[PDB]
Coordinates of C-alpha atoms in Angstrom, one line a residue:
Chain D
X1 CA -9.9 -13.7 0.6
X2 CA -6.7 -11.8 -1.1
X3 CA -3.4 -11.0 0.8
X4 CA -2.2 -7.6 -0.8
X5 CA 0.3 -5.0 1.1
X6 CA -1.2 -3.7 2.8
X7 CA -0.8 0.2 5.1
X8 CA -3.1 1.5 7.8
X9 CA -5.5 4.2 7.6
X10 CA -3.7 8.2 7.1
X11 CA -6.6 9.8 8.3
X12 CA -5.4 10.2 11.8
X13 CA -2.1 10.9 11.1
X14 CA -2.7 13.6 7.8
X15 CA -4.6 15.6 10.6
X16 CA -0.8 16.0 12.5
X17 CA 1.4 17.1 9.5
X18 CA 2.5 20.2 9.4
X19 CA 5.8 22.4 6.0
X20 CA 9.0 23.3 8.7
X21 CA 10.5 26.3 7.0
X22 CA 14.0 27.6 8.9
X23 CA 15.9 29.9 5.5
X24 CA 15.9 28.2 2.6
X25 CA 15.3 24.4 3.9
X26 CA 11.7 23.4 4.0
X27 CA 10.7 19.9 5.5
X28 CA 7.5 18.3 7.3
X29 CA 7.2 17.7 10.7
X30 CA 4.5 15.7 13.2
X31 CA 2.1 18.3 14.9
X32 CA 1.7 16.4 18.3
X33 CA -1.0 18.8 21.2
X34 CA 1.7 21.8 21.0
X35 CA 4.1 20.1 19.6
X36 CA 6.1 20.1 16.3
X37 CA 8.9 17.8 16.0
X38 CA 11.2 17.3 12.4
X39 CA 14.2 16.5 11.9
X40 CA 16.9 18.6 12.7
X41 CA 18.7 19.4 9.3
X42 CA 16.1 21.9 8.5
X43 CA 18.5 24.4 10.4
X44 CA 21.5 23.0 7.4
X45 CA 22.0 24.6 3.8
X46 CA 23.7 23.5 1.0
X47 CA 27.6 24.1 2.2
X48 CA 26.1 22.7 6.3
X49 CA 25.8 19.1 5.6
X50 CA 28.7 17.6 4.7
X51 CA 29.7 18.1 8.3
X52 CA 27.8 20.3 10.1
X53 CA 27.9 20.6 14.2
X54 CA 24.0 20.7 15.4
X55 CA 24.8 22.5 18.8
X56 CA 26.8 24.8 16.9
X57 CA 23.6 25.7 14.6
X58 CA 20.9 25.4 16.7
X59 CA 22.5 28.1 19.3
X60 CA 22.7 30.5 16.0
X61 CA 19.1 30.5 15.9
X62 CA 16.1 31.7 18.0
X63 CA 12.5 31.0 18.2
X64 CA 11.1 33.0 15.0
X65 CA 13.6 31.6 12.4
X66 CA 11.1 28.6 12.9
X67 CA 8.1 29.3 10.3
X68 CA 6.0 26.4 10.9
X69 CA 2.8 26.2 8.4
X70 CA -0.4 24.2 8.9
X71 CA -2.4 24.4 5.7
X72 CA -2.9 28.0 5.2
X73 CA -2.1 28.8 9.8
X74 CA 1.4 30.2 10.5
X75 CA 1.5 28.6 14.1
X76 CA 3.8 31.1 16.4
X77 CA 7.4 28.7 17.5
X78 CA 7.4 30.7 21.2
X79 CA 10.5 28.0 22.3
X80 CA 12.2 25.1 20.6
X81 CA 14.9 21.8 21.3
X82 CA 17.2 19.9 19.5
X83 CA 16.5 16.4 21.3
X84 CA 19.0 13.7 19.8
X85 CA 18.3 14.0 15.9
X86 CA 14.6 15.7 15.8
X87 CA 13.4 19.5 16.4
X88 CA 11.0 19.5 19.5
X89 CA 9.4 23.4 18.5
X90 CA 6.5 24.4 21.0
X91 CA 3.9 26.1 19.1
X92 CA 1.0 28.5 21.2
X93 CA -1.3 26.0 19.7
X94 CA -2.2 22.5 20.0
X95 CA -3.0 20.1 17.4
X96 CA -6.8 19.7 17.6
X97 CA -6.9 16.7 15.6
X98 CA -3.6 15.1 18.0
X99 CA -4.6 11.6 17.8
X100 CA -3.8 9.6 21.0
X101 CA -0.8 8.4 20.5
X102 CA 2.5 6.6 21.7
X103 CA 6.6 7.3 20.4
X104 CA 7.7 3.0 20.3
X105 CA 10.8 2.5 18.8
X106 CA 10.5 -0.6 16.1
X107 CA 12.9 -4.0 15.9
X108 CA 14.2 -5.1 12.9
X109 CA 11.3 -7.8 10.9
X110 CA 8.3 -5.7 11.9
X111 CA 6.5 -3.7 9.7
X112 CA 4.8 -0.5 9.2
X113 CA 2.9 2.2 7.1
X114 CA 4.6 5.0 5.8
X115 CA 2.7 8.4 4.7
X116 CA 5.5 10.2 2.8
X117 CA 4.2 13.7 2.3
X118 CA 5.7 17.0 0.5
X119 CA 6.2 19.9 1.9
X120 CA 3.5 19.0 4.7
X121 CA 1.1 18.0 2.2
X122 CA 0.6 14.3 2.6
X123 CA 0.8 12.1 -0.9
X124 CA 1.0 8.8 -0.7
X125 CA 0.7 5.7 1.8
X126 CA 2.5 2.7 1.7
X127 CA 4.2 -1.1 3.6
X128 CA 7.3 -1.1 5.4
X129 CA 10.0 -3.4 7.0
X130 CA 12.5 -2.2 8.8
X131 CA 15.1 -4.7 7.3
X132 CA 18.1 -6.9 9.6
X133 CA 20.5 -3.8 9.0
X134 CA 18.3 -0.9 10.5
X135 CA 17.3 0.2 6.8
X136 CA 14.0 0.6 4.8
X137 CA 12.9 0.2 0.7
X138 CA 11.1 2.7 0.8
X139 CA 10.4 5.3 -2.1
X140 CA 11.2 9.3 -1.0
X141 CA 12.3 12.1 -2.6
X142 CA 13.4 15.8 -2.2
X143 CA 11.8 17.1 0.8
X144 CA 9.8 13.6 1.7
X145 CA 11.9 14.3 5.7
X146 CA 9.4 14.9 8.1
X147 CA 7.2 11.8 6.4
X148 CA 6.5 9.8 10.1
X149 CA 6.0 5.5 9.9
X150 CA 3.9 4.5 11.9
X151 CA 1.1 1.5 13.4
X152 CA -2.3 1.6 14.6
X153 CA -2.9 -0.8 17.4
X154 CA -7.0 0.4 18.8
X155 CA -7.4 4.1 18.4
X156 CA -3.6 4.7 19.2
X157 CA -1.6 5.8 16.3
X158 CA 2.3 4.0 17.1
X159 CA 4.8 6.5 16.1
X160 CA 7.7 4.6 15.0
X161 CA 9.9 6.5 12.4
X162 CA 10.8 9.7 10.6
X163 CA 12.5 9.9 7.6
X164 CA 16.4 12.0 7.4
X165 CA 17.6 10.3 3.8
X166 CA 19.3 7.9 1.4
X167 CA 22.2 5.1 0.5
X168 CA 23.6 5.5 -1.8
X169 CA 22.6 1.6 -3.0
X170 CA 19.1 3.4 -2.7
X171 CA 17.8 1.9 0.4
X172 CA 16.6 4.7 3.8
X173 CA 17.3 5.5 6.7
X174 CA 15.7 7.6 9.5
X175 CA 14.9 8.2 13.0
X176 CA 12.5 6.9 16.0
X177 CA 10.3 9.7 16.9
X178 CA 12.7 11.1 20.1
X179 CA 15.8 12.1 17.4
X180 CA 17.5 8.2 18.1
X181 CA 18.1 6.5 14.9
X182 CA 17.6 3.3 14.0
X183 CA 21.3 2.2 12.8
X184 CA 24.7 2.9 12.9
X185 CA 23.6 5.8 10.6
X186 CA 24.0 9.5 11.5
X187 CA 22.2 13.4 9.5
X188 CA 25.1 14.4 7.3
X189 CA 25.9 13.8 3.3
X190 CA 29.4 11.4 3.9
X191 CA 29.7 8.0 2.3
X192 CA 27.9 5.3 4.2
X193 CA 26.9 2.2 3.7
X194 CA 24.2 -0.4 6.0
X195 CA 25.7 -3.1 7.0
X196 CA 25.0 -7.4 5.3
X197 CA 21.2 -7.7 4.7
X198 CA 19.6 -11.2 6.0
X199 CA 16.3 -12.3 5.1
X200 CA 13.7 -11.9 8.1
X201 CA 12.4 -16.2 8.3
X202 CA 10.0 -15.5 10.5
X203 CA 7.8 -13.3 8.1
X204 CA 8.6 -15.4 4.8
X205 CA 6.9 -18.1 7.1
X206 CA 3.7 -16.2 8.1
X207 CA 3.4 -15.4 4.6
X208 CA 3.4 -19.1 3.4
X209 CA 1.2 -19.7 5.9
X210 CA -0.5 -17.0 4.3
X211 CA -0.5 -18.7 0.4
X212 CA -1.9 -21.8 2.7
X213 CA -4.9 -19.7 3.4
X214 CA -5.2 -18.4 0.3
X215 CA -5.0 -22.2 -1.6
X216 CA -1.7 -21.4 -2.7
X217 CA 0.1 -25.2 -1.6
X218 CA 2.0 -26.5 -4.3
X219 CA 4.8 -26.1 -2.1
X220 CA 3.9 -27.9 1.3
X221 CA 5.7 -31.1 1.1
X222 CA 5.2 -34.9 3.0
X223 CA 8.8 -33.5 5.2
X224 CA 9.6 -32.4 8.3
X225 CA 12.8 -30.9 9.7
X226 CA 14.2 -30.2 12.9
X227 CA 14.6 -26.7 14.0
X228 CA 18.5 -27.0 14.0
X229 CA 19.2 -28.9 10.6
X230 CA 17.1 -26.0 9.1
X231 CA 19.7 -23.4 10.5
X232 CA 21.8 -24.8 9.2
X233 CA 20.2 -24.2 5.3
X234 CA 19.4 -20.9 6.6
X235 CA 22.9 -19.6 7.2
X236 CA 24.0 -20.7 3.7
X237 CA 21.4 -18.9 2.5
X238 CA 21.8 -15.5 4.5
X239 CA 18.8 -16.1 6.6
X240 CA 18.3 -15.7 10.4
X241 CA 18.4 -18.3 12.2
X242 CA 14.7 -19.6 13.8
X243 CA 14.4 -19.5 16.8
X244 CA 12.2 -21.8 19.8
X245 CA 10.0 -18.0 20.1
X246 CA 9.3 -17.9 16.2
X247 CA 7.7 -21.0 16.3
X248 CA 5.3 -19.9 18.8
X249 CA 4.1 -16.5 17.3
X250 CA 3.9 -18.9 14.8
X251 CA 1.1 -21.0 16.1
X252 CA -1.9 -19.6 15.3
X253 CA -1.3 -19.2 11.7
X254 CA 0.2 -23.7 12.6
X255 CA -3.1 -24.4 13.9
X256 CA -5.5 -22.6 11.7
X257 CA -4.1 -24.6 8.2
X258 CA -3.3 -27.6 10.8
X259 CA 0.6 -27.5 9.0
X260 CA 3.0 -27.9 11.7
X261 CA 5.3 -25.1 11.9
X262 CA 8.4 -27.6 10.9
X263 CA 6.6 -28.6 8.1
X264 CA 6.5 -25.8 6.9
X265 CA 11.2 -24.9 7.0
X266 CA 10.9 -28.1 5.3
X267 CA 8.8 -26.8 2.8
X268 CA 11.2 -23.4 2.9
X269 CA 14.2 -25.4 3.3
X270 CA 13.2 -27.2 -0.4
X271 CA 11.6 -23.4 -1.8
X272 CA 15.5 -22.2 -1.1
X273 CA 17.2 -25.0 -2.3
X274 CA 15.2 -26.2 -5.5
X275 CA 13.5 -22.8 -6.5
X276 CA 10.7 -22.3 -7.8
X277 CA 11.0 -24.1 -10.5
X278 CA 9.3 -21.2 -12.4
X279 CA 6.0 -21.1 -10.2
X280 CA 4.7 -18.1 -8.5
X281 CA 3.5 -17.6 -4.6
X282 CA 0.9 -15.1 -3.7
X283 CA 1.7 -14.1 -7.0
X284 CA 5.4 -13.5 -6.3
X285 CA 8.3 -15.3 -8.2
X286 CA 10.4 -15.2 -5.4
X287 CA 10.3 -15.8 -0.8
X288 CA 8.9 -12.3 0.8
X289 CA 10.6 -11.3 3.8
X290 CA 8.5 -7.7 5.1
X291 CA 4.8 -9.2 6.2
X292 CA 5.1 -10.1 10.0
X293 CA 2.5 -12.9 12.0
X294 CA 0.9 -10.2 12.9
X295 CA 0.0 -9.0 9.7
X296 CA -0.7 -12.5 8.0
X297 CA -3.3 -13.3 10.9
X298 CA -4.9 -9.1 10.6
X299 CA -5.2 -10.5 6.6
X300 CA -5.9 -14.1 7.3
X301 CA -7.9 -15.7 10.1
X302 CA -11.2 -14.9 7.8
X303 CA -10.7 -18.0 5.7
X304 CA -10.7 -21.3 6.0
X305 CA -9.9 -23.1 2.3
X306 CA -9.7 -26.6 3.5
Chain X
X1 CA 26.7 9.4 -0.7
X2 CA 24.5 9.5 2.1
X3 CA 22.0 11.5 1.0
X4 CA 20.0 14.0 3.7
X5 CA 16.4 14.2 2.5
Chain F
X1 CA 14.3 7.2 -5.1
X2 CA 12.4 4.3 -4.5
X3 CA 9.4 2.6 -5.9
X4 CA 6.9 1.3 -4.0
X5 CA 3.0 0.5 -4.2
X6 CA 1.6 3.5 -3.2
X7 CA -2.3 4.0 -2.0
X8 CA -3.7 7.7 -1.6
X9 CA -4.5 8.9 1.8
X10 CA -7.7 7.7 2.5
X11 CA -8.2 10.7 5.7
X12 CA -11.0 12.3 3.1
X13 CA -12.2 8.4 2.3
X14 CA -12.7 7.5 6.2
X15 CA -14.8 10.6 6.9
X16 CA -17.4 9.1 4.6
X17 CA -17.3 5.3 5.8
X18 CA -20.6 4.6 7.5
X19 CA -22.6 1.2 8.4
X20 CA -25.3 -0.3 6.9
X21 CA -27.7 -2.7 8.6
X22 CA -31.3 -3.9 6.9
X23 CA -32.1 -6.9 9.5
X24 CA -29.3 -9.5 10.4
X25 CA -27.5 -8.1 7.0
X26 CA -24.6 -5.7 7.8
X27 CA -21.9 -3.9 5.5
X28 CA -20.2 -0.3 4.6
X29 CA -22.3 2.0 2.9
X30 CA -20.9 5.7 1.7
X31 CA -22.0 8.7 3.1
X32 CA -21.7 11.7 1.1
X33 CA -23.6 14.8 1.7
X34 CA -26.9 13.4 2.1
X35 CA -26.7 10.1 0.8
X36 CA -25.8 7.1 1.9
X37 CA -24.6 4.2 -1.4
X38 CA -24.3 1.4 -0.4
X39 CA -24.5 -2.7 -2.5
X40 CA -28.1 -3.6 -2.8
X41 CA -27.1 -7.2 -1.2
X42 CA -27.5 -5.6 2.2
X43 CA -31.5 -6.6 1.9
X44 CA -30.7 -9.8 1.5
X45 CA -30.5 -13.2 4.1
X46 CA -28.5 -16.5 3.7
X47 CA -31.7 -18.4 1.6
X48 CA -31.6 -15.3 -1.0
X49 CA -28.3 -14.6 -2.7
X50 CA -28.7 -17.9 -4.5
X51 CA -30.8 -16.2 -6.8
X52 CA -32.8 -12.6 -5.5
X53 CA -35.2 -10.8 -7.2
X54 CA -33.6 -6.9 -5.7
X55 CA -36.5 -5.8 -7.3
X56 CA -39.1 -8.4 -5.2
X57 CA -37.3 -7.9 -2.3
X58 CA -37.0 -3.8 -2.0
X59 CA -40.6 -3.5 -2.7
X60 CA -40.8 -5.8 0.8
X61 CA -38.9 -2.2 2.5
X62 CA -39.4 0.7 3.4
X63 CA -37.2 3.4 5.5
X64 CA -37.4 2.4 8.5
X65 CA -35.9 -1.4 7.7
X66 CA -33.0 0.1 7.2
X67 CA -30.0 0.8 9.3
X68 CA -27.8 3.6 9.8
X69 CA -24.9 3.9 11.5
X70 CA -21.9 6.9 11.2
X71 CA -19.6 6.0 14.8
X72 CA -22.0 6.6 17.6
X73 CA -24.7 8.6 15.5
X74 CA -27.2 6.8 14.4
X75 CA -28.6 8.5 10.7
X76 CA -32.4 8.2 9.9
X77 CA -33.1 6.9 6.6
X78 CA -35.4 9.4 5.1
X79 CA -35.7 7.7 2.0
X80 CA -34.4 5.4 -0.6
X81 CA -33.8 4.1 -3.9
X82 CA -32.2 1.1 -6.2
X83 CA -29.8 2.4 -9.3
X84 CA -29.0 -0.5 -11.0
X85 CA -26.6 -2.5 -7.8
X86 CA -26.1 0.4 -5.9
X87 CA -28.6 1.1 -2.6
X88 CA -29.0 5.1 -2.2
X89 CA -30.4 5.6 1.1
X90 CA -31.2 9.8 1.5
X91 CA -30.6 10.2 5.1
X92 CA -31.9 13.4 7.2
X93 CA -28.1 14.2 7.7
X94 CA -25.5 15.5 5.3
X95 CA -22.1 14.0 6.1
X96 CA -20.2 17.9 7.2
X97 CA -17.2 15.7 6.5
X98 CA -18.2 15.2 2.5
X99 CA -15.0 16.3 0.0
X100 CA -15.4 17.3 -3.6
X101 CA -16.2 13.6 -5.3
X102 CA -16.5 12.5 -8.5
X103 CA -18.4 9.2 -9.7
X104 CA -15.7 8.1 -12.6
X105 CA -15.7 4.6 -14.0
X106 CA -12.1 3.8 -14.7
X107 CA -10.9 1.3 -17.9
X108 CA -8.8 -1.9 -17.2
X109 CA -5.6 -1.2 -16.7
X110 CA -6.5 1.7 -14.2
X111 CA -4.9 1.9 -11.3
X112 CA -6.9 2.9 -8.4
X113 CA -6.9 2.6 -3.9
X114 CA -8.6 0.6 -1.6
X115 CA -10.0 1.3 1.4
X116 CA -10.9 -2.0 2.7
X117 CA -13.3 -1.2 6.1
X118 CA -15.2 -3.8 7.8
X119 CA -18.6 -2.3 9.7
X120 CA -18.2 1.7 8.7
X121 CA -14.1 1.0 10.3
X122 CA -11.6 1.2 8.0
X123 CA -9.0 -1.0 8.3
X124 CA -6.5 -0.1 6.0
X125 CA -5.6 1.0 2.2
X126 CA -3.7 -0.8 -0.5
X127 CA -3.2 -0.2 -4.3
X128 CA -5.1 -1.8 -7.2
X129 CA -6.0 -2.5 -10.7
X130 CA -8.1 -3.3 -12.9
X131 CA -7.6 -6.2 -14.7
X132 CA -8.1 -6.7 -18.7
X133 CA -10.7 -8.7 -17.7
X134 CA -13.1 -6.8 -15.1
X135 CA -11.6 -8.2 -12.0
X136 CA -9.2 -6.6 -9.1
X137 CA -6.8 -8.7 -6.8
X138 CA -7.9 -7.3 -3.6
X139 CA -8.5 -9.3 0.0
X140 CA -11.4 -8.9 1.0
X141 CA -12.8 -11.1 4.0
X142 CA -16.7 -11.0 5.2
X143 CA -18.7 -7.9 5.6
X144 CA -15.9 -6.2 3.5
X145 CA -18.3 -5.3 0.5
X146 CA -19.2 -1.5 0.6
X147 CA -16.0 -0.6 0.4
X148 CA -15.0 1.8 -1.8
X149 CA -12.2 2.4 -4.5
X150 CA -10.6 6.0 -5.0
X151 CA -8.1 8.5 -7.1
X152 CA -7.5 11.2 -5.7
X153 CA -6.8 14.1 -8.5
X154 CA -5.2 17.4 -6.7
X155 CA -8.0 17.6 -3.3
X156 CA -10.6 15.7 -5.1
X157 CA -12.2 12.5 -4.7
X158 CA -12.8 10.3 -7.5
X159 CA -14.6 7.5 -6.0
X160 CA -14.0 4.6 -9.5
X161 CA -14.9 1.4 -7.1
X162 CA -17.5 -0.9 -4.8
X163 CA -16.5 -4.2 -4.0
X164 CA -19.6 -6.6 -4.2
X165 CA -18.2 -10.4 -3.9
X166 CA -15.5 -12.5 -4.9
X167 CA -15.1 -15.2 -7.6
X168 CA -13.9 -18.6 -7.2
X169 CA -10.5 -17.9 -8.6
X170 CA -9.5 -16.0 -5.6
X171 CA -10.1 -12.4 -7.4
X172 CA -12.9 -9.5 -6.8
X173 CA -15.8 -8.0 -8.3
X174 CA -17.3 -4.6 -7.9
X175 CA -19.3 -1.7 -9.9
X176 CA -19.2 2.0 -9.9
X177 CA -20.7 4.0 -8.0
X178 CA -23.8 4.5 -9.5
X179 CA -24.3 0.3 -9.3
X180 CA -23.2 -0.6 -13.1
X181 CA -21.3 -3.3 -12.7
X182 CA -16.8 -3.7 -14.1
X183 CA -17.7 -6.6 -16.2
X184 CA -20.0 -9.7 -17.1
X185 CA -20.2 -10.4 -13.0
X186 CA -23.7 -10.4 -10.9
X187 CA -24.5 -10.0 -7.4
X188 CA -25.8 -13.1 -6.9
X189 CA -24.3 -16.4 -5.7
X190 CA -24.0 -18.3 -8.5
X191 CA -20.8 -20.1 -10.8
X192 CA -19.4 -16.8 -12.6
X193 CA -15.8 -17.0 -14.2
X194 CA -13.7 -14.1 -15.1
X195 CA -12.7 -14.0 -18.5
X196 CA -9.6 -15.4 -19.6
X197 CA -6.6 -12.4 -18.4
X198 CA -4.2 -10.7 -20.0
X199 CA -0.9 -8.6 -19.1
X200 CA -1.3 -4.8 -19.1
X201 CA 1.5 -4.1 -21.4
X202 CA 2.1 -0.1 -21.6
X203 CA 2.0 -0.7 -17.3
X204 CA 5.1 -2.7 -18.0
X205 CA 6.8 -1.1 -20.1
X206 CA 5.6 2.5 -17.3
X207 CA 7.6 0.2 -15.4
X208 CA 10.6 -0.9 -16.4
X209 CA 11.4 3.2 -16.9
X210 CA 11.1 3.5 -13.3
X211 CA 13.5 1.0 -13.1
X212 CA 15.6 2.7 -15.1
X213 CA 14.7 5.9 -13.1
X214 CA 16.0 4.3 -9.8
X215 CA 19.4 2.4 -11.8
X216 CA 18.4 -1.1 -13.2
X217 CA 19.5 -1.2 -16.4
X218 CA 20.3 -4.3 -16.5
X219 CA 17.4 -5.6 -18.9
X220 CA 18.7 -2.7 -21.3
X221 CA 19.9 -3.4 -24.7
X222 CA 21.0 -2.3 -28.3
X223 CA 18.7 -3.4 -29.9
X224 CA 14.7 -1.9 -30.9
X225 CA 11.8 -3.5 -32.8
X226 CA 9.4 -1.8 -34.3
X227 CA 5.6 -2.1 -33.6
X228 CA 3.7 -5.0 -35.0
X229 CA 6.8 -7.4 -34.3
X230 CA 6.7 -6.2 -31.0
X231 CA 2.9 -7.1 -31.0
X232 CA 3.7 -10.4 -32.2
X233 CA 5.4 -11.8 -29.9
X234 CA 3.0 -9.7 -27.0
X235 CA 0.4 -11.9 -28.7
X236 CA 2.2 -14.9 -28.0
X237 CA 2.9 -13.9 -24.5
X238 CA -0.4 -13.4 -23.6
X239 CA 0.3 -9.4 -23.8
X240 CA -2.4 -6.4 -24.6
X241 CA -1.4 -5.5 -28.4
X242 CA 0.6 -1.8 -27.7
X243 CA -0.8 1.3 -29.6
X244 CA 0.9 4.7 -31.5
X245 CA -1.3 5.9 -28.2
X246 CA 0.4 3.8 -25.0
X247 CA 4.1 4.9 -26.8
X248 CA 2.4 8.4 -26.5
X249 CA 1.7 8.0 -23.0
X250 CA 5.3 6.5 -22.2
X251 CA 6.1 10.0 -24.4
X252 CA 7.7 11.7 -20.9
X253 CA 9.0 8.5 -19.4
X254 CA 10.7 8.1 -22.7
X255 CA 12.3 11.3 -22.7
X256 CA 13.4 12.1 -18.7
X257 CA 15.4 8.8 -19.4
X258 CA 16.8 8.9 -23.2
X259 CA 15.3 5.8 -23.8
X260 CA 13.0 5.3 -26.6
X261 CA 9.8 3.8 -26.0
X262 CA 10.9 0.6 -28.7
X263 CA 13.7 -0.2 -27.3
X264 CA 12.3 -0.6 -24.0
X265 CA 9.8 -2.9 -26.5
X266 CA 13.0 -4.8 -27.0
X267 CA 14.7 -4.7 -24.1
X268 CA 11.0 -6.0 -22.8
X269 CA 10.3 -8.8 -25.9
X270 CA 14.2 -10.1 -24.2
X271 CA 12.8 -10.7 -21.3
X272 CA 9.7 -12.2 -22.8
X273 CA 11.4 -14.8 -24.5
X274 CA 14.7 -15.1 -22.2
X275 CA 12.9 -14.5 -18.6
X276 CA 15.2 -12.6 -15.7
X277 CA 17.8 -16.1 -15.6
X278 CA 17.6 -15.6 -12.0
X279 CA 17.9 -11.4 -11.7
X280 CA 14.8 -9.0 -9.9
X281 CA 13.9 -5.5 -11.6
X282 CA 12.9 -3.4 -8.0
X283 CA 12.8 -6.1 -6.3
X284 CA 10.7 -8.5 -8.3
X285 CA 11.3 -11.3 -9.9
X286 CA 9.1 -11.1 -12.3
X287 CA 7.2 -7.9 -14.9
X288 CA 4.8 -5.9 -12.9
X289 CA 1.8 -4.5 -14.4
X290 CA -0.6 -2.5 -12.3
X291 CA 1.3 0.6 -12.2
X292 CA 0.4 2.7 -14.6
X293 CA 2.8 5.6 -16.9
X294 CA 1.0 8.0 -14.3
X295 CA 1.7 6.2 -10.8
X296 CA 5.4 5.9 -12.7
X297 CA 6.0 9.9 -13.3
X298 CA 4.0 10.5 -9.4
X299 CA 6.5 8.4 -7.7
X300 CA 10.1 8.9 -9.8
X301 CA 10.4 12.2 -12.2
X302 CA 11.8 14.1 -9.1
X303 CA 14.7 11.7 -10.0
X304 CA 17.6 11.5 -12.2
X305 CA 20.5 8.6 -12.0
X306 CA 22.5 9.5 -15.3
Chain I
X1 CA -19.4 -20.6 -6.8
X2 CA -19.2 -16.7 -7.0
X3 CA -19.4 -15.3 -2.7
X4 CA -21.6 -12.2 -2.1
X5 CA -19.1 -9.8 0.8

């Protein structure tokens, strides 16, 4: 048993991280087949980052301006292309460690693992969730750009995120692997604010189910509620509205625990109105919303604890 | 305010 | 910036996980050089696990009774040996992916990353801390035995834990890679209880420093305190006594933040006596003790936020 | 009570 914020094994992603240097700017790149993907602001310097015209800056560079290092091996850039906010550097060598992969754009409320890299060398891995305002609460320092977020379906790496910048509130923003930003953010050092964040309700309910599968049942109650009366309380507490599709997604967890979804919503309503009164759920004193129903099933279905 | 990585 | 429970990249450990089968028992093994390490209860069945004499059970087996699978490749066991609570299976092939490694036994309060594996296939990675009662709060299901805990110094994997069982309270127990259990636990399915757990005080203080480096300063105060008067309050709240060596370890964090250690202890004393009054620190509503000063320095020294 | 993995 037990429940932890679990990241996917990073071995298949570690073999694709490279270091991309353009002038004095150095960041991480994703080496898949004979293409290296990296944030396009590697072509900028300190005087450019306020408001750079990236097409102007890119046309002033050629293939020899990009130094790509894969460990101690240097890759020759034989072609370059800008795809929205990411650079696509064609190199002379196909990555022999290239796993089967896909480029997917995830939804708010979904999770993924982050491999934080510095100078093409991975240093840590952790799980992240895309907030409803298209930000993530990660851990990124200088030189961490090019770090990728990913999920592993079976043997196929689903790349979904590339890190680009940090907002003034401490949250982080980036793009998918096609260069399209998550949210209304742009890769320039101007005053940018994320939208008002909300709590992912379906994730909280799945996390409550994980507590019951692990034997934390003090929050359960005899009450039940309608979906509309729950959504009325969810709005007051800045929770996303619960849909009928969310209830269907929580179906497998509802059957394994024997607790109806609307019964669990009545427990969440009491937790929202009353609080926890000093108690904890799965070792946490607040309601967690960074666990998807998939994350719970993958960690808790081999348990009963009836 | 936003800082590029 | 940002602060997350960060695990080490698992690529160098993923290449060493194998599946060990003895009869109908299947678990994970650690393949380093030409030796496979696995929990010794792989030689037991359901009728043995109440009180097995492992030396009796091992002398009744030979090398042909152990089927070791590394992916689709089968390794022939050319020798076996019991080292305390782990089996050492000599195999015909040296693991070509063997990294530089060490076998270390960690201390209570120290952390490590866990690669949860099932049938020799890694499925997740997360950070864990050895509790003062020599347990860990992990996430392990059936077949997860043989999963290893590790730290990465530079390029050297420091193996420190191998999973063996779960206690009735939901916590987990295991051994170091030499087969010696952490704590007063034995590999048999009897009623076993962990000692009374305590909060790692030096980890809480380092975590408070990480909050200041990230700009959570609402808990700071003008007060300071003596080390003895803090240890008097720490005892009442089931905290470990703070030593002069702990203050020295927090030195680097004390210099970077400009906050003396005894000033931070006065803030912790107020947090212990008053609580948080509904506020949060680094997104948590309780005091975290699973971050060592090393874990904080590795994630926060590239920040100032003065 | 203790359960072997």
